[PDB]
Ligand binder design. Structure first.
Ligand code: GDP
Ligand code: MG
Length: 201
């Protein structure tokens, strides 16, 4: 099978568990591995070139108590580092998560996601999101509770791993129905503001 270990990391409380859980089959088929303090969710996605399975590793909360063991990171073939757009500290801690990860796994494709963009009161705006630039990471705004941009990180990663820049998803996996509305106007403003921030580089 055409699988990839994906490591999902970032501060406690940023929405990691909530985000992996959108993918309903992935949630139903998860596998808990107590030796490592993890739930591995098999998130299958279907591309114009067939299926790709991301085995997403979700913590059991130990990130609140400290850093993650070598256990968690080894063999990762990709990753998502998450922060909370309503907390500057969580963004401020991004560099530390990236450093812990690349320590074990040097040349991985990584996406950075700013979560909870459904919240009107946004603290970490596009202009302040610079970490990913010099590190060659993709960035996406995300709202786990509304599925907003759910696919984006996975689609960019599938492209890097398969080596097809044109890959697309032919159908979406069944997702948990949006629990909160993502205001369409905020989405439009934010996507552009990222594009405006990128041209100051
Ligand atoms: N509105 C909103 N709240 C969110 C979102 N993602 C997470 N939260 C809230 O953030 C808290 C932490 O979420 P959790 O998924 O357990 O995160 P984790 O500790 O990083 O794995 C809970 O109150 C979530 O419901 C999001 O997309 N929108
Ligand atoms: Mg969690």
């Amino acid at each position: 099978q055409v699988q990839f270990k994906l490591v999902l990391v970032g501060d406690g409380g940023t929405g990691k568990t909530t985000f992996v859980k959108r993918h309903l089959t992935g949630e139903f088929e998860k596998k808990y591995v107590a030796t490592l303090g993890v739930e591995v969710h098999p998130l299958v996605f279907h591309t114009n070139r067939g299926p790709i399975k991301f085995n997403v590793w979700d913590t059991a909360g130990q990130e609140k108590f400290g850093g993650l063991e070598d256990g968690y990171y080894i063999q990762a073939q990709c990753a998502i580092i998450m922060f909370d757009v309503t907390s500057r500290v969580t963004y401020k801690n991004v560099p530390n998560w990236h450093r812990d990860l690349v320590r074990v796994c040097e040349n991985i494709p990584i996406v950075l996601c700013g979560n909870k963009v459904d919240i009107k009161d946004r603290k970490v705006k596009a202009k302040s999101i610079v970490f990913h630039r010099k590190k060659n990471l993709q960035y996406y705004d995300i709202s786990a509770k509304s599925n907003y941009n759910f696919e984006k990180p996975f689609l960019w990663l599938a492209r890097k791993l398969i080596g097809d820049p044109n890959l697309e998803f032919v159908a979406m996996p069944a997702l948990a129905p949006p629990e909160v509305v993502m205001d369409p106007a905020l989405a439009a403003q934010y996507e552009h503001d990222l594009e405006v921030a990128q041209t100051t580089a």
